[PDB]
Design a binder for this molecule. Structure first.
Ligand code: CLA
Ligand code: CLA
Ligand code: CLA
Ligand code: CLA
Ligand code: CLA
Ligand code: CLA
Ligand code: CLA
Ligand code: CLA
Ligand SMILES: CCCCCCCCCCCCCCCC(=O)OC[C@H](COP(=O)(O)OC[C@@H](O)CO)OC(=O)CCCCCCCCCCCCCCC
Ligand SMILES: CC1=C(C/C=C(\C)CCC[C@H](C)CCC[C@H](C)CCCC(C)C)C(=O)c2ccccc2C1=O
Ligand code: SF4
Ligand code: SF4
Lengths: 164, 32, 71, 741, 80, 41, 144, 74
């Protein structure tokens, strides 16, 4: 109960929706022989379904009046009430990989600018240079702040403009 | 009570027929 | 030949876009032929009187049709 | 020998060295990128072989091996459909009950919840219900086992490898010379004789010896593992004489010309098999026999190496009259020295074939348990009309490519083509008139019915209970084709289809085919079709005839086939090329064929399809085509709104992917309107403003970002428009008809 | 009529005149480039404004420059 | 096969190998770790 | 030597069966444009109005409604056929106007004596702002 | 159009009473398509039919009339 909400292990619409999905799977299962190949896949779907409900109720997700889990996207209401794995932990688990790709592509461009003709190594990617920059880009925030402290991250007004 | 049976054909069939005529004649006038 | 009285270049247009651009750059007063800044401001002032009179005529029509054909 | 094999040994060395160099085919693209327009010109000019080189021999070699590439891809595709029919299907179950088991041949992997798409198709099986009609083909061929499907899938892989090896051989190792390709008389004799004639003779052999006895034992009612295998039907004449008692006389009635004794298994029944709702396979057997004899006669027409036969240049140069100048002189030399002029005619007649196939496979359903599978019927009609309409627009495109590139005024003086160019203004003006006439007198009938139904005046509408517009001519043709077994085809036991009149064939409680009444709404929609087909002809033929010049631009042929414009001058000259005319004809082919497939999907659901109880048969939509298609609001309510009520609530079911694509193709369609409405000088400046941001953070690419070209952005817009509209209608049709059909 | 002006960035490579579909442009003697020649627009009454001249100008920020003005029966490119 | 390896290093071939790699990594993850809505432990 | 040739309609037309792309009422009321060229041999050329005509040996005369049609015909006669054509301008009151090679020399070659109209002795980036040309009587570009 | 779709549908579900019918359906675009556009355009398109007409027929006509101008714009 952060903003009119309720834990999903407490709310009854969540359990009613679990029983609704298991009821649809059960009346779907009632047509087949108990050991046939469709019935095995239907019971495996039931097992994945029940494991999904158990692990959404276990992590302390907040349900609403609809019986559906919600995501508190504010630190200080996620850190204080234990919901940092909703948004606040994957908002850095994403940005590590985002700045990773943005650093690997940056360094692949800068390490191919100073050649004979760079464009041929942009349609035909130099794979050993690409995999070297793929592995050694693991510490990208480190190298990014060390590049920002120089001023070698930005370029000055050598850039191309029109008519200011 | 006879106003919607008279003003509506004038405004839609008669006064636009003036406007389809007099505002069209003004278009192709030869400039002196 | 006559209808864009404001545009002598549109008036010499033998095609049918003379009509369409006489209707469309009629209120672009700054691009009119012989336009000065004083006549610009004077036409804008008269235009604002025309817009105010249309707004009041429209509201009076709303009032009259509600008073006459309404409940 | 004038007609002889003539090749060149080892013309092109087989090496991966030119795979390393993209753009090797083009003189301009071989220097590499400096600009992102390069990589779109790489894929756009990839197969335009006529612009790579000027040597017609090299062009013909490239287009002859590219056809082996397409054939290898089609054999991979067919072999995959046989393999997915073998290993992932309920076809074994479907053969025992082909009325309560849905044909399924695609199973998904249970990962992200997509295993809900493995619906309960029946037969102890879960998968996606297919609608491509392969199971009805396989019953009509006499398959009866997934072992035969697996082995013809292996044969399809072998034949795909044969096609890929053949293209490699006839391009790299022993490639034919130019005057090999210019033997069109030999190509027509071999294709009418060997492809069409011997192929239908061979399919006649398979139908006589394999599919007639197997399907007769299926229709009598025999388990498919109890049926004799077809090699036991070849070797044992006693089983074939048990099934058809004139196999005991052997091939003696064929050579004594006592062919009437073969009337046990070559028939002229007509109508439908009432056991299964398809055509009689004895009737299709005699069909392919007669087709085989006809095309083997037709393939001995043209002169190749002996003095007998016709030569097509002498056929063309003789047919000339007083009205048409020099007549057909010069048409042989432009249909032998231009591949685009061939591809125009072939795409035209082949796309007309697809539509004739689509109209001839609903009314005369050729497969067992095809007609009561309503989803297969709807998807086959829709598929083949779309393939036909695309091929007709490609005909209109490649005719104009011939006009721009390969047309020569020296070779064409006062022949037919020159005299058509010299009255193109009369042609396009009269077609403009007839398009405007058809537009008013077809769509204004719908606007009239909208207005009268909205003004509380239903008596003044155009309907059957109002001002009637009866299709007297099509109704007269229906009467004559229903009375054709009386005196104009006296050896027909029934009419050639059930649409002309009579009773209904009912299979499994569902109507296979019943007679189709043609009323006022049928009149109005056939004239909607005539209108939209004439407008598509107007646009495509205006692009062909004005491909080289007009009164607007007299030197349009110097600008090319595919150019955006000739600037803002002389009023504006946007979209003046022939490419832009086939661009605008693609929208009208979409417009026409969407109404064609809507008219099919609502005429069939209203007046043909539905369950029968032998108690006054109740159709699917209750019989509201003639009663409610008078109005645009009737097509809105009772067709789009009413029948979208199964694609919109398909979530949580096996049809839910059709619920997703119906949204997604509503996306892509509207996404196309970003490309169709906007223009390049916006997006190039937006790319400048973000190239600045990539310059500021040292991440400007060396291949410089450009906006798409003008005729590239038009191509992207029309491609996304067609994809998003056709896939919307795809998902709508299939989610409607799998559920309620 | 349209306004066709040229500028002194002309290198005299006479490509606008060959690109012109209406003979608006012609080459005039001049002494500001190596080719000793510069274009001219004496016949802007016949110009339609189709801008083929400034698809053919090689100089960055084009030396020929068409400004779409009033439209006569020749500027609209009419056979009627 | 040096030219074959330069062909394998072109833009669409690297795109269709790397997208199958990053597809069939996430697909094996969602097989062995079903339904990750929230970062658990 | 060269001084402004004149025209007679006595010179023949190339053999052409007539198209629907020919002249209109603008030819009879406003103006129409005629083209002359001397051909060396009889050969087939594409009309700018659609269709193929065969030119005959000696002088030819062909009439059009646009200057672009006549210059397109000159463009394909000078390139494909290496001929030297010239077209004029005819008004309905009989007044004829020499239009193509004014000085005889084709305009892509310097004749040393033609005058440079519509030239700006300044760079195109050195145009004034549109605020400086505002209220110039008519609407006006900064290139003037 | 987005702000007025959102205003109209949250107020239709408010005026009908079932705000949960909005809260469960407005989270996904199919719920916007079938619970707002498909659902509330029943009595609109039934303004006229072959059975008769009612007072919404002038809005049934204009709804098609607006569909006709829009496409003509294309
Ligand atoms: C869009 C900006 C924004 C807004 C409107 C709020 C709104 C709020 N924050 Mg919050 N917050 C934000 C950004 C924001 N936060 C950011 C970027 C951080 C740092 C990561 C925090 C850290 C934070 C803490 C640590 C706390 C809040 C608290 C609060 C509440 C008072 C209120 C719900 C407080 C709370 O729990 O409510 C009483 C509280 O203790 N916030
Ligand atoms: C609010 C309504 C309004 C007002 C106040 C004016 C006011 C004026 N119009 Mg105008 N006009 C209007 C609506 C209006 N117009 C509409 C809807 C059209 C049709 C598109 C025109 C078309 C029009 C033309 C064609 C011309 C004017 C002209 C004029 C001026 C006399 C005056 C300033 C004239 C003008 O500016 O010439 C000096 C003129 O020639 N108007
Ligand atoms: C029906 C599908 C099909 C077929 C048969 C071909 C056939 C061909 N393409 Mg092509 N192509 C296709 C689809 C197809 N393309 C598509 C969808 C695109 C993207 C728009 C391209 C883009 C493309 C480019 C960019 C190039 C080709 C090239 C070629 C030729 C080289 C053949 C070769 O090396 O095969 C051997 C390859 C195998 C994989 C063997 C099959 C086992 C051949 C004519 C090249 C060409 O035309 O050079 C003249 C070339 O550079 N194609
Ligand atoms: C053009 C024809 C075509 C098409 C569209 C498909 C499409 C499909 N096949 Mg198939 N297949 C084909 C030809 C085709 N096949 C042929 C010719 C063969 C014989 C070699 C097979 C043999 C085959 C097998 C053995 C299997 C499929 C499977 C699949 C499915 C998943 C494929 C996948 O995940 O890729 C895998 C990704 C990469 C290879 C990368 C998909 C529906 C799978 C399936 O349906 O599972 C239920 C499966 O197990 N296919
Ligand atoms: C009776 C002989 C015969 C037969 C059956 C064919 C059949 C075919 N020709 Mg063809 N052709 C022939 C003689 C023949 N040709 C002659 C004599 C010439 C020279 C004048 C040509 C010149 C020619 C050209 C230029 C082209 C064709 C193409 C085609 C294909 C059309 C596509 C189609 O319908 O796929 C139907 C598919 C099948 C029938 C699958 C079965 C495949 C069989 C086994 C191969 C075809 C039979 C083959 C000719 C026999 C030779 C065997 C080989 C070992 C020598 C088709 C396979 C086009 C094509 O697609 O090329 C690949 C094409 O571009 N032909
Ligand atoms: C290319 C097609 C093709 C092929 C390969 C065959 C092949 C065969 N037929 Mg057949 N047949 C065909 C077309 C074909 N037929 C057609 C079109 C008809 C209709 C006229 C027949 C009618 C027919 C009869 C009536 C009989 C055969 C028989 C036979 C078998 C022996 C032929 C013989 O005695 O010498 C052989 C398996 C005989 C047999 O024993 O078959 C089981 C036999 O009795 N055929
Ligand atoms: C037998 C069929 C056939 C054949 C052989 C050709 C052959 C040719 N056409 Mg043609 N054409 C055809 C049918 C055919 N066409 C049809 C049916 C149409 C109507 C749509 C056209 C319309 C057409 C135009 C308008 C033009 C050509 C051009 C060309 C030439 C070059 C094509 C090229 O390099 O594309 C290379 C391949 C591509 C660019 C890929 C196209 C991708 C498509 C558009 C997207 C759809 C793909 C898929 C179905 C959608 C789902 C994909 C999924 C990932 C979402 C070549 C001579 C061009 C030409 O001659 O230039 C002068 C040209 O401008 N054709
Ligand atoms: C719903 C949208 C719509 C409509 C109505 C039209 C209408 C038309 N298009 Mg068009 N078009 C459209 C969308 C549309 N287009 C789109 C989206 C594209 C994009 C690719 C094109 C591309 C296109 C091309 C490329 C061509 C056309 C052509 C035509 C004309 C053929 C029909 C005709 O003449 O019949 C008559 C007119 C109608 C059916 C329109 C409705 C009129 C109703 C029925 C009655 C009239 C109203 C009535 C008198 C009341 C008047 C009230 C009063 C106050 C004025 C017509 C002007 C063709 C053309 O002009 O040549 C013939 C042509 O070549 N269109
Ligand atoms: C269809 C009725 C058209 C009459 C018909 O079939 O063709 C009659 C006539 C055929 O002319 P000939 O009898 O000279 O035919 C010689 C042909 O073999 C082609 O050279 O064609 C023409 O006069 C042009 C037809 C377009 C006429 C446009 C009318 C629309
Ligand atoms: C959006 C738009 C653009 C901009 C579209 C840009 C130019 C292309 C869109 C991006 C393409 C898809 C390239 C992005 C993908 C690259 C290949 C990089 C791939 C990187 C990884 C995914 C491998 C136009 O250029 C345009 C031109 C004319 C009329 C309308 C429009 C128009 O509407
Ligand atoms: S517009 Fe450009 S191209 Fe057309 S004529 Fe005038 S200058 Fe020559
Ligand atoms: S503009 Fe370009 S082309 Fe025209 S003259 Fe100056 S340089 Fe030569």
């Amino acid at each position: 109960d952060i903003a009119g909400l309720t834990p999903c292990s407490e709310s009854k619409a969540y359990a009613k929706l679990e029983k609704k999905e298991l009821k649809t799977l059960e009346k779907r299962l009632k047509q087949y022989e108990a050991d046939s190949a469709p019935a095995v896949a239907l019971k495996a779907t039931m097992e994945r379904t029940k494991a999904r409900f158990a692990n959404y109720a276990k992590a302390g997700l907040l349900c609403g009046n609809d019986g559906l889990p919600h995501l508190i996207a504010d630190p200080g209401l996620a850190l204080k009430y234990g919901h940092a794995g909703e948004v606040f932990i994957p908002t850095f688990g994403f940005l590590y990989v985002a700045g990773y790709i943005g650093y690997v592509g940056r360094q692949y461009l800068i390490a191919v600018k100073g050649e004979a003709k760079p464009t041929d190594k942009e349609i035909i990617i130099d794979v050993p240079l690409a995999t070297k920059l793929a592995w050694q880009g693991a510490g990208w925030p480190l190298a990014a702040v060390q590049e920002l402290q120089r001023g070698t991250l930005l370029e000055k007004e050598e850039n191309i403009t029109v008519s200011p | 009570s006879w106003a919607p049976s008279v003003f509506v054909p004038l405004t839609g069939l008669v006064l636009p027929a003036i406007a389809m005529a007099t505002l069209f004649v003004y278009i192709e006038k030869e400039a002196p | 030949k006559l209808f864009p009285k404001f545009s002598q270049g549109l008036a010499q247009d033998p095609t049918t876009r003379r009509i369409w651009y006489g209707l469309a750059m009629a209120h672009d007063f700054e691009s009119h032929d012989g336009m000065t800044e004083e006549n610009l401001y004077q036409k804008i002032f008269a235009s604002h009187f025309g817009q105010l009179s249309i707004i009041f005529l429209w509201t009076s029509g709303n009032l009259f049709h509600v008073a006459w054909q309404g409940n | 020998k004038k007609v002889k094999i003539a090749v060149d040994r080892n013309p092109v060395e087989t090496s991966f060295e030119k795979w390393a160099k993209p753009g090797h085919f083009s003189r301009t693209l071989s220097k590499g990128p400096n600009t992102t327009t390069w990589i779109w010109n790489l894929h756009a000019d990839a197969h335009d072989f006529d612009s790579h080189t000027s040597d017609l021999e090299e062009i013909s070699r490239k287009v002859f091996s590219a056809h082996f590439g397409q054939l290898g891809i089609i054999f991979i595709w067919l072999s995959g459909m046989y393999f997915h029919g073998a290993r992932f299907s309920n076809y074994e179950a479907w053969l025992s009950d082909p009325t309560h088991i849905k044909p399924s041949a695609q199973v998904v992997w249970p990962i992200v919840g997509q295993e809900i798409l493995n619906g309960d198709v029946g037969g102890g099986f879960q998968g996606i219900q297919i609608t491509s009609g392969f199971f009805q083909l396989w019953r009509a061929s006499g398959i009866t086992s997934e072992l035969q499907l697996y082995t013809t899938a292996i044969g399809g892989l072998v034949m795909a490898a044969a096609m890929f090896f053949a293209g490699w051989f006839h391009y790299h190792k022993a490639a034919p010379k130019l005057e090999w390709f210019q033997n069109v008389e030999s190509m027509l004799n071999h294709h009418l004789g060997g492809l069409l004639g011997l192929g239908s003779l061979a399919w006649a052999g398979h139908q006589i010896h394999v599919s007639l006895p197997v399907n007769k034992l299926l229709d009598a009612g025999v388990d498919p593992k109890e049926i004799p295998l077809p090699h036991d039907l070849l070797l044992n004449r006693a089983i074939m004489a048990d099934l058809y008692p004139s196999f005991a006389k052997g091939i003696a009635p064929f050579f004594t010309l006592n062919w009437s004794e073969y009337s046990d298994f070559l028939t002229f029944k007509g109508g439908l098999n009432p056991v299964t709702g398809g055509l009689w396979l004895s009737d299709t057997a005699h069909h392919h026999v007669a087709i085989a004899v006809l095309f083997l006669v037709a393939g001995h027409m043209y002169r190749t190496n002996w003095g007998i036969g016709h030569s097509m240049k002498e056929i063309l140069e003789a047919h000339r009259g007083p009205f048409t100048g020099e007549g057909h002189v010069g048409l042989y030399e432009i249909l032998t020295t231009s591949w685009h002029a061939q591809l125009a005619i072939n795409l035209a007649l082949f796309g007309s074939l697809s539509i004739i196939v689509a109209h001839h496979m609903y009314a005369m359903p050729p497969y067992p348990y095809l007609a009561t599978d309503y989803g297969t019927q709807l998807s086959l009609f829709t598929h083949h009309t779309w393939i036909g309409g695309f091929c007709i627009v490609g005909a209109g495109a490649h005719a104009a490519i011939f006009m721009v590139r390969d047309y020569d005024p020296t070779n064409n003086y006062n022949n037919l083509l020159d005299r058509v160019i010299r009255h193109r203004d009369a042609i396009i003006s009269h077609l403009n008139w007839v398009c405007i006439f058809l537009g008013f007198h077809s769509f204004g009938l719908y606007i009239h019915n909208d207005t009268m139904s909205a003004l509380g005046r239903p008596q003044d509408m155009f309907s059957d209970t109002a001002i009637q517009l009866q299709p007297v001519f099509a109704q007269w043709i229906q009467n004559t084709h229903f009375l054709a077994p009386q005196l104009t085809a006296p050896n027909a036991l029934a009419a050639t289809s059930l649409t002309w009149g009579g009773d209904l064939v009912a299979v499994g409680g569902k109507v296979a085919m019943m007679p189709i009444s043609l009323g006022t709404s049928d009149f109005m929609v056939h004239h909607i079709h005539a209108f939209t087909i004439h407008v598509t002809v107007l646009i495509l033929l205006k692009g062909v005839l004005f491909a080289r010049s007009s009164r607007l631009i007299p030197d349009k042929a110097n600008l090319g086939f595919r150019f955006p414009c000739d600037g803002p001058g002389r009023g504006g000259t946007c979209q003046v090329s022939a490419w832009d005319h086939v661009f605008l004809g693609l929208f009208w082919m979409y417009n026409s064929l969407s109404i064609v497939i809507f008219h099919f999907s609502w005429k069939m659901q209203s007046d043909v399809w539905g369950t029968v109880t032998a108690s006054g048969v109740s159709h699917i939509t209750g019989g509201n085509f003639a009663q409610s298609a008078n109005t645009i609001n009737g097509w809105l309510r009772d067709f789009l709104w009413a029948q979208s009520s199964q694609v919109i609530q398909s979530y949580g079911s096996a049809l839910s992917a059709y619920g997703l694509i119906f949204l997604g193709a509503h996306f892509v369609w509207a996404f196309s309107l970003m490309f169709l409405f906007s223009g390049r000088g916006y997006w190039q400046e937006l790319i400048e403003s973000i190239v600045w941001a990539h310059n500021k953070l040292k991440v400007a690419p060396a291949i410089q970002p450009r906006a798409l070209s003008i005729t590239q952005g038009r191509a992207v817009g029309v491609a996304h428009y067609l994809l998003g509209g056709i896939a919307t209608t795809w998902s709508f049709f299939l989610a409607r008809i799998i559920s309620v059909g | 009529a349209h306004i066709v002006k040229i500028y002194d960035t002309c290198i005299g490579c006479t490509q606008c005149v060959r690109a012109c579909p209406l003979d608006v442009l012609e080459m005039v003697p001049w002494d500001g480039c190596k080719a000793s020649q510069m274009a001219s627009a004496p016949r802007t009454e016949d110009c339609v404004g189709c801008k083929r001249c400034e698809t053919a100008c090689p100089t960055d920020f084009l030396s020929v420059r068409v400004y779409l003005g009033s439209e006569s029966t020749r500027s609209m490119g009419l056979s009627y | 096969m040096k030219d074959f390896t330069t062909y394998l290093s072109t833009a669409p071939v690297i795109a269709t190998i790397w997208f199958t790699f990053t597809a069939g990594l996430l697909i094996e993850i969602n097989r062995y770790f079903p339904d990750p809505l929230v970062f658990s432990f | 030597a060269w001084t402004v040739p004149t025209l007679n309609p006595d010179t023949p037309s190339p053999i052409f069966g007539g198209s629907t792309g020919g002249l209109l009422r603008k030819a009879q009321t406003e103006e129409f444009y005629v083209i002359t060229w001397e051909a060396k041999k009889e050969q087939i050329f594409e009309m700018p109005t659609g269709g193929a005509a065969i030119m005959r040996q000696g002088p030819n005369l062909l009439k059009f409604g646009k200057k672009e049609q006549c210059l397109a015909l000159t463009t394909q006669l000078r390139n494909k056929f290496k001929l030297t054509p010239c077209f004029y301008r005819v008004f309905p009151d009989g007044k004829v106007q020499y239009l193509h090679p004014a000085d005889g020399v084709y305009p892509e070659k310097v004749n040393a004596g033609r005058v440079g109209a519509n030239q700006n002795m300044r760079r195109i980036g050195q145009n004034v702002n549109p605020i400086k040309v505002k209220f110039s009587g008519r609407m006006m570009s900064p290139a003037e | 159009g987005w702000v007025t779709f959102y205003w109209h549908w949250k107020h239709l579900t408010l005026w009908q009473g079932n705000v949960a019918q909005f809260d469960e359906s407005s989270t996904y675009l199919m719920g916007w398509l079938r619970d707002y556009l498909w659902l509330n355009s029943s009595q609109l398109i039934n303004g006229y039919n072959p059975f008769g007409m009612n007072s919404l027929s002038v809005w049934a006509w204009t709804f098609l009339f607006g569909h006709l101008i829009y496409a003509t714009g294309f």
